[PDB]
Scaffold this active site. Structure first.
Site, short mmCIF file in Angstrom:
data_model
loop_
_atom_site.label_atom_id
_atom_site.label_comp_id
_atom_site.label_asym_id
_atom_site.label_seq_id
_atom_site.Cartn_x
_atom_site.Cartn_y
_atom_site.Cartn_z
N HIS A 301 21.44 58.66 40.87
CA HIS A 301 21.11 60.03 41.30
C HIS A 301 22.20 61.02 40.97
O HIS A 301 21.92 62.10 40.38
CB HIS A 301 20.76 59.99 42.77
CG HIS A 301 20.37 61.33 43.34
ND1 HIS A 301 19.06 61.66 43.58
CD2 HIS A 301 21.13 62.38 43.79
CE1 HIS A 301 19.03 62.86 44.16
NE2 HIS A 301 20.26 63.33 44.24
N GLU A 302 23.44 60.75 41.41
CA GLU A 302 24.50 61.70 41.11
C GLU A 302 24.71 61.87 39.64
O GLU A 302 25.00 62.97 39.20
CB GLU A 302 25.83 61.36 41.85
CG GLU A 302 25.67 61.13 43.35
CD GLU A 302 24.80 62.10 44.10
OE1 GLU A 302 24.73 63.32 43.80
OE2 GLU A 302 24.17 61.68 45.10
N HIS A 305 22.13 64.16 38.01
CA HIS A 305 22.36 65.58 38.30
C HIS A 305 23.25 66.23 37.20
O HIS A 305 23.27 67.45 37.12
CB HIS A 305 23.09 65.77 39.63
CG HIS A 305 22.23 65.87 40.83
ND1 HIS A 305 21.23 66.82 40.93
CD2 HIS A 305 22.37 65.33 42.05
CE1 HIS A 305 20.70 66.74 42.13
NE2 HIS A 305 21.40 65.87 42.85
C1 LIG Z 1 15.60 63.39 51.76
C2 LIG Z 1 16.98 63.88 51.81
C3 LIG Z 1 17.30 64.97 52.57
C4 LIG Z 1 18.61 65.41 52.65
C5 LIG Z 1 19.57 64.76 51.95
C6 LIG Z 1 19.24 63.64 51.23
C7 LIG Z 1 20.19 63.00 50.49
N1 LIG Z 1 21.39 62.48 50.58
C8 LIG Z 1 22.28 62.89 49.86
O1 LIG Z 1 23.29 62.31 49.62
N2 LIG Z 1 21.92 64.17 49.36
C9 LIG Z 1 22.86 64.88 48.66
C10 LIG Z 1 22.98 66.25 49.13
C11 LIG Z 1 24.35 66.77 48.83
C12 LIG Z 1 24.40 68.25 49.16
C13 LIG Z 1 25.39 66.01 49.69
C14 LIG Z 1 22.37 64.89 47.19
O2 LIG Z 1 21.25 65.27 46.86
N3 LIG Z 1 23.34 64.43 46.30
O3 LIG Z 1 22.92 64.62 44.98
C15 LIG Z 1 17.94 63.22 51.17
ZN LIG Z 2 20.96 65.22 44.77
#
Ligand SMILES: Cc1cccc(CNC(=O)N[C@H](CC(C)C)C(=O)NO)c1
Ligand SMILES: [Zn+2]
Ligand SMILES: [Mg+2]
Ligand SMILES: [Mg+2]
Ligand SMILES: [Mg+2]
Length: 890
Positions: A301-302, A305
């Site tokens: 995922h990261e 991005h």
């Molecule tokens: C479904 C969902 C809601 C909110 C957050 C997440 C994901 N967990 C993460 O680690 N999300 C991060 C958000 C960053 C602003 C820390 C993410 O998308 N990293 O790419 C899932």
């Molecule tokens: Zn993300």
């Protein structure tokens, strides 16, 4: 409350071109000096210059070396720095500030903070403004020159984004390092880390341009041994983006860093991805199997991005799904490819239809592109992420791989180095669609409704077969329930992947095809259909909808046995269980409310049970698939189908169904539990942190699911098996021994044994906490108090707090105790946690999202606790907005 609206987006009157930072870490303060090379944009109308800046202590402010003074040239209210327009230059200018911040007391884990002995940042979404002043919004793109200084003994590794261009000594045992990130970026992608970190590294050579990239993964010293699988997953992620998307990494170095205290999974800061340790670190002797999957997905995922978010970023936060939905879709494609197991896609579907569908039927329901917010942080939701991913995946279904790849390339190239909107993506996909249809008048304008319309569509079917004509029709209707976002719902473009199964021989009757439903209803007709078929609908779960298959249980059983598509097989099973659950629930409910002395229950379909046995006994059927068929649907899935749900009635319903099936199958379950041992627990690769056999992991999953079934059943002498299982070298097995021992007097001995096995690894101890928390114990409340006193104590580590409480909240019988004591306990944790970490406090609100689905006594108890939380003095804006929305006040 201050409300931001999507329609009111306007570009800034200012431009920030370069950011030059000096971050000087000391024991009791960090000093941040920052020069912003700025200019006036074409949109400027001579307004005041207003910077975001939260909780900063100002040492100095200047413009072009002219000191500015509070009350005379600027005001600061702890949130916004306003420079009066007379003092704002009319062409290029240098803005300088120096502020003091305090990572050592930042327990909110946003901005610059201390996690154990590591100083780390988290800037997405609004964290950069807690480090220094900025126009903190993602359309303000700039290049960054970052110097970090610190005590050398304490903080020998210093990192920020991009190329390390110098390292130097400083008097008094300090040192510095300077970074240049050549890629324009929004401030949410800034990162710095300082710590006594250890690493593993490798060199990756890009596929097309043969660029050498140095890959580093970092942790605290104690856990350096747990970095290897992350590094391997990074290499896999890089190869996948090359191979599928033609995308190569764009810097000479990529660093990944684990920290113990992190609000979610991880963060894509350019060249410096920062992870919750639970999403980067594992070892096979010290981690459960699910850690490997989690690390693969989060690293992927990261990494993905780097293009979908970084190289192409967001115009504004309402576009969040353009990067998260699209990145989750990329991550899902990658995970499916890497694991080659059908349970991967199933798991994504299970999560959507449980948590995301619940959200979409709740007062929190939003489209994947929201129209407004108070705290943008409350829109990092399963809707934006997981429904967004399914919206991004439908383009692939509609286009096919070749035309999907073309559209994606149009998007990524056109918008490179810039911001984008959901419309830009839809336009690129629409160019591909025209090419696919060879018709430059085709359009995807209707498709945009997937971004703007909230709620889950319901798709239902009717069938007719004309034997004389060999002609079959599928008549399809779609409905979305009106809600607070739209009083009138429009039909969507719904792609319906379909097959047709001959029920006489179990074989495929047509080339798979994708029906494009664009109206409220439509009838699709097929010729040269030689016998009446059983339709195989929404193959692969081809749209994010409620499916009403209108099939008999006999037809569902035939698909479960004989269809090709794993989702349809699983969904047919799901549907047979749902029919049974709702019927038995209504039987139990009527008995309870009418105070009957006797009544009947509808038995579980005997042919379905025979089907389960046939699949389990097939040595060539998939182990992971088997574990889904012997499990009832998750409670959050079931609750989407019941209004005024009595949770105690539901618990009794599930117990009756499970007992009916075990009364027929337990001996099969035992035989399988034993027969799978050799292959499941084979130690091939046990010392290889670069390779995971996901099929073998699914075998363990099946064994552990079976063991739970047999333990709950009190199958004769199963305690012997539980004790043997606790001796396995796989943590997945020995922690399962603890949960399944809940049904026996041996539970407290296994609690102690596994505690001792877990207590010296931070992450393994958290997995032990979760195992205890989800244990099916009548005394769970006294066990929670024991965890609080003996293990959790005063911890502010989100992973510790989440491990203790969230699993317990999924205990249907105990969390929803009619006294309300479960609701009270979690509400106290929420309120406590909100005083130092509002984002985590809102996460802990999750069990309350279904409040208006419950029976009216439980609704009243949950509402009482929500309103008590809302009354708390100094409640965060995050928690207050969440709870106001959830209780229909906002
Ligand atoms: C479904 C969902 C809601 C909110 C957050 C997440 C994901 N967990 C993460 O680690 N999300 C991060 C958000 C960053 C602003 C820390 C993410 O998308 N990293 O790419 C899932
Ligand atoms: Zn993300
Ligand atoms: Mg402060
Ligand atoms: Mg994921
Ligand atoms: Mg700790």
């Amino acid at each position: 409350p201050k409300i931001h609206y999507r329609k009111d987006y306007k570009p800034s009157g200012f431009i920030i071109n370069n950011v030059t930072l000096n971050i000087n870490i000391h024991d009791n303060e960090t000093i941040v000096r920052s020069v912003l090379d700025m200019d006036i944009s074409k949109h400027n109308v001579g307004e005041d210059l207003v910077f975001d800046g939260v909780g900063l202590k100002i040492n100095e402010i200047s413009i072009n070396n002219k000191k500015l003074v509070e009350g005379e040239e600027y005001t600061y209210d702890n949130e916004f720095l306003t420079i009066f327009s007379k003092f704002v230059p009319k062409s290029k200018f240098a803005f300088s500030s120096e502020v003091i911040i305090h990572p050592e007391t930042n327990y909110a884990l946003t901005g610059l903070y201390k996690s154990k002995n590591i100083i780390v940042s988290q800037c997405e979404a609004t964290g950069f403004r807690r480090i220094t002043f900025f126009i903190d919004r993602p359309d303000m793109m700039a290049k960054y020159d970052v110097t970090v200084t610190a005590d050398k003994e304490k903080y020998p590794v210093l990192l920020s984004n991009g190329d390390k261009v110098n390292e130097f000594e400083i008097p008094g045992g300090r040192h510095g390092a300077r970074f240049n990130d050549p890629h324009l970026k929004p401030c949410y992608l800034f990162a710095v880390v300082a710590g006594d970190l250890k690493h593993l590294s490798a060199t990756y050579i890009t596929k097309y341009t043969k660029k050498k990239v140095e890959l580093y993964v970092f942790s605290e010293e104690k856990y350096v041994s747990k970095l290897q699988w992350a590094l391997e997953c990074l290499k896999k992620s890089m190869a996948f983006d090359e191979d599928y998307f033609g995308l190569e990494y764009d810097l000479s170095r990529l660093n990944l860093v684990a920290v113990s205290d992190f609000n979610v999974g991880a963060m894509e800061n350019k060249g410096l991805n920062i992870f919750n340790a639970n999403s980067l670190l594992a070892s096979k002797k010290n981690s459960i199997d699910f850690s490997y999957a989690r690390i693969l997905t989060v690293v992927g995922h990261e990494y993905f991005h780097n293009y979908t978010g970084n190289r192409v970023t967001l115009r504004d936060w309402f576009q969040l799904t353009l990067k998260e939905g699209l990145t989750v879709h990329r991550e899902n494609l990658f995970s499916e490819e890497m694991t080659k197991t059908v349970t991967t896609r199933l798991s994504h579907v299970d999560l959507l239809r449980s948590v995301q569908f619940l959200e979409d039927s709740s007062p929190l329901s939003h489209p994947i592109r929201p129209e407004s917010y108070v705290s943008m942080e409350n829109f990092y939701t399963t809707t934006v992420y997981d429904k967004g991913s399914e919206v991004m995946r439908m383009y692939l279904t509609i286009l096919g791989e070749e035309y999907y790849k073309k559209g994606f390339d149009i998007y990524i190239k056109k918008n490179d180095g810039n911001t984008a909107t959901c419309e830009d993506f839809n336009y690129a996909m629409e160019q591909a669609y025209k090419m696919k249809k060879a018709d430059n008048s085709a359009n995807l304008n209707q498709y945009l409704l997937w971004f703007s319309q909230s709620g889950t569509p319901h798709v239902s079917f009717k069938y007719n077969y004309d034997a004389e004509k060999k002609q079959y029709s599928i008549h399809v209707n779609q409905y979305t329930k009106p809600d607070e976002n739209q009083k009138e719902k429009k039909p969507l473009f719904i792609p319906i992947s379909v097959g047709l199964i001959n029920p006489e021989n179990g074989k495929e009757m047509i080339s798979q095809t994708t029906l494009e439903l664009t109206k409220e209803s439509d009838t699709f007709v097929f010729n040269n259909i030689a016998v009446k078929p059983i339709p195989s609908l929404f193959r692969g779960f081809s749209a994010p909808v409620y499916i009403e298959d209108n099939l008999t249980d006999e037809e569902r059983i035939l698909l479960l046995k004989y269809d090709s598509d794993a989702f349809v097989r699983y969904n047919s099973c799901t549907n047979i269980y749902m029919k049974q659950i709702l019927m038995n629930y209504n039987e139990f409910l009527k008995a309870k409310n009418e105070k009957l002395e006797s009544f009947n229950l509808t038995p579980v379909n005997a042919q379905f049970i025979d089907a389960i046995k046939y699949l389990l006994e097939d040595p060539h059927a998939d182990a992971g698939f088997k574990s889904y068929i012997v499990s009832l649907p998750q409670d959050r899935y079931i609750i989407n189908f019941v209004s005024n749900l009595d949770t105690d009635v539901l618990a009794d319903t599930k117990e009756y169904i499970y007992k009916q099936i075990g009364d027929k199958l337990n001996d099969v379950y035992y035989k399988m539990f034993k027969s799978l041992e050799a292959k499941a627990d084979d130690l091939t690769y046990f010392n290889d942190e670069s390779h995971v056999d996901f099929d073998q992991m699914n075998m363990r999953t099946l064994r552990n699911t079976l063991l739970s079934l047999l333990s709950k059943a009190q199958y004769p002498n199963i305690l012997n098996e539980i004790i043997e299982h606790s001796k396995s070298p796989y943590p997945s097995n020995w922690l399962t021994s603890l949960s399944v021992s809940a049904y026996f007097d041996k539970y407290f001995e296994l609690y102690d044994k596994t505690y001792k096995l877990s207590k010296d690894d931070e992450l393994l101890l958290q997995e032990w906490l979760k195992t205890v928390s989800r244990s099916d114990r009548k005394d769970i409340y006294e066990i929670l108090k024991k965890l609080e006193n003996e293990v959790l104590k005063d911890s502010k580590n989100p992973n510790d707090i989440r491990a203790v409480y969230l699993p317990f909240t999924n205990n249907l019988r105990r969390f929803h105790d009619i006294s309300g004591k479960g609701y009270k306990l979690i509400a106290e944790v929420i309120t406590k946690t909100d005083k130092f970490n509002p984002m985590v406090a809102t996460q802990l609100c999750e069990p309350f999202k279904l409040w208006n689905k419950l029976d009216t006594k439980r609704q009243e108890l949950m509402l009482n606790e929500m309103n008590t939380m809302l009354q708390e003095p100094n409640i965060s804006n995050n928690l207050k907005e969440y709870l106001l929305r959830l209780t229909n006040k906002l």
